[PDB]
Amino acid sequence: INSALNQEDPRTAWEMLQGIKAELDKVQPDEQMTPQREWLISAQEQVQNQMNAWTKAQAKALDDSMKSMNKLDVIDKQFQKRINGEWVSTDFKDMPVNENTGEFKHSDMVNYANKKLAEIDSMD
Amino acid sequence: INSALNQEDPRTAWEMLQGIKAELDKVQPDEQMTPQREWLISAQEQVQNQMNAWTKAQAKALDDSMKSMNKLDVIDKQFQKRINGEWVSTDFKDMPVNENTGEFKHSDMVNYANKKLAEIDSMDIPDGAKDAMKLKYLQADSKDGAFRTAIGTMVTDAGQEWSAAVINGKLPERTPAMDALRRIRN
Amino acid sequence: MDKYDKNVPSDYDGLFQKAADANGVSYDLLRKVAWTESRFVPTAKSKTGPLGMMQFTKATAKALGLRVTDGPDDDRLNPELAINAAAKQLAGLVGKFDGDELKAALAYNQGEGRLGNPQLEAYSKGDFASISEEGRNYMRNLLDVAKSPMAGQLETFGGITPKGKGIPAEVGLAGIGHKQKVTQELPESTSFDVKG
Amino acid sequence: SPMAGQLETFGGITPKGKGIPAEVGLAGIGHKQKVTQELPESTSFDVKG
């Protein structure tokens, strides 16, 4: 039970606990509450708490990557406006800033230029 | 009960606990305190604590956004004073700083310039008045401001057009920047 | 925001009486629904954030039969026509539910379709366990100002004992909150004015 | 399947119980993303004199 509670993925821990419950059903073949079924109920509650803490980190990482994608989209929009003949600044210090982008960096422009060159090279 | 305690929104957790209480009322149809009603009372207390911790984060986020709105308001007031004929600095490094604003950034001026241009574009006035307002904001702007940076692309392009034409000995078929700058001069 | 402020000096309510008389909806219900949706807040910021008093969505705004595709990307920003449309929808809902049933009409909150029809059927059966948490809370918030035959069965749902009453989240979590430390008191600048 | 009933009664708390799939035991537990694809928009300095 303690090793099933020290897994990094809660979905694996849940199935491990189900396997342990199946093992216990062969030595306690009745329906009453025993101090060993309390072990398993507490373990399942702990796994639910672990799932909460895990979804924290997953959401935070997804937000971090999505901010970079949003910044690339904003830079692409700015060059598209400039190429069409509008008077806007294509410097990364002059890009519009939101809560969905954060602050822009030079590496953002480097990545955008590399991606754009590759995309143009992949055209038919 | 444990899954109802692992919700992100406390208001949903409270209603889930009410549903669980309704379910329990059908198997314990009396008024005495049982160890299973203690579960639900403790769960409701925990949800109240979660509501406290949730209001922390909500208030903090609202403060963070309200500081940005306050900074934009301060910049707008500064340009309004400068346009009316007062001797104040419209550089973001010289804006008054409070506990309701924090420190100013260049992106604040960028956002203010974009918002102001959009707002002027959304006005129900003839184009001449819009040009007059845009030129007033351009004149009141500081040396490295966002208004002067937006129109600096026009000047750079016009200078490049003329220099390239002199080198090549022929004007190109299109000189959009020179035409735009000449119209603004007019 | 506590107790909905029933007798507060009524701000910008020169529109609810007229819509109520035009469509037949109760004044108290319409005012309470407006307060619940927007709290009479002129900004009303959210994921969609309609600043109008009736915090609609694009799908509902277009389905209401208006000319929403006008003005600032949405025509339901002027309060009077949006409030009148909401009142007409509420009156149509109340009338179509066999009498003055002022709480099944809260299909207004959930709609009719894949996610609203079974909840309304469960309400008809009186089985509040099949209604969603959002719907149950939204109906709980309207118990003070509503006329329904099941207004007493909903309040005695979720009690700690079968003779107890359920606690709405607006009461169990009431008073728990934190103040904002940032205010709209801006710093002021002074001009270097020397008139020689 | 002929063993669709034997798999569901595997992992129950009692021999007469049913096992709980992780999609049900951990259902509803999650957090929303605070970042959206609503981008900030730029405006051109357009003066047509």
Side-chain angles (χ1 to χ4, degrees), chain C residues 21-172:
Chain C
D21 282 274
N23 302 101
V25 191
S26 179
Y27 168 60
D28 282 353
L29 179 74
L30 196 46
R31 184 176 178 179
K32 178 55 153 287
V33 167
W35 193 80
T36 300
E37 292 298 331
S38 179
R39 278 86 66 195
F40 300 142
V41 185
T43 181
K45 202 58 59 177
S46 72
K47 177 255 291 181
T48 307
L51 63 90
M53 295 298 102
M54 295 296 172
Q55 188 184 13
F56 290 163
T57 63
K58 291 184 182 293
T60 72
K62 308 204 291 153
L64 274 173
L66 292 177
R67 52 188 301 274
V68 59
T69 76
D70 194 66
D73 181 272
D74 275 326
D75 203 11
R76 80 292 185 277
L77 275 298
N78 204 6
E80 86 269 25
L81 73 164
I83 292 179
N84 281 40
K88 185 183 286 185
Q89 180 183 24
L90 269 186
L93 286 165
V94 174
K96 78 180 294 296
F97 283 139
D98 282 333
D100 205 81
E101 180 74 88
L102 265 182
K103 292 177 71 68
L106 277 297
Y108 171 85
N109 175 254
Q110 297 278 295
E112 290 94 337
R114 194 173 42 88
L115 282 72
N117 189 359
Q119 297 176 28
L120 290 157
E121 294 325 289
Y123 180 96
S124 61
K125 309 164 166 285
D127 169 84
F128 300 112
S130 296
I131 308 175
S132 46
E133 277 83 32
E134 173 177 34
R136 270 198 269 122
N137 191 228
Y138 198 77
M139 311 173 43
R140 274 200 204 276
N141 285 1
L142 307 193
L143 276 177
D144 51 359
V145 297
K147 311 302 171 273
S148 179
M150 293 180 183
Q153 293 179 356
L154 169 78
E155 66 183 1
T156 196
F157 175 84
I160 195 76
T161 71
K163 286 184 198 223
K165 314 289 171 207
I167 318 168
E170 65 183 1
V171 183

Side-chain angles (χ1 to χ4, degrees), chain B residues 24 28 30-41, chain C residues 160:
Chain B
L24 186 75
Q28 304 199 336
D30 212 341
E31 316 292 309
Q32 295 98 0
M33 266 297 282
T34 56
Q36 285 79 40
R37 302 183 156 121
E38 167 72 14
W39 292 351
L40 289 162
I41 300 175
Chain C
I160 195 76

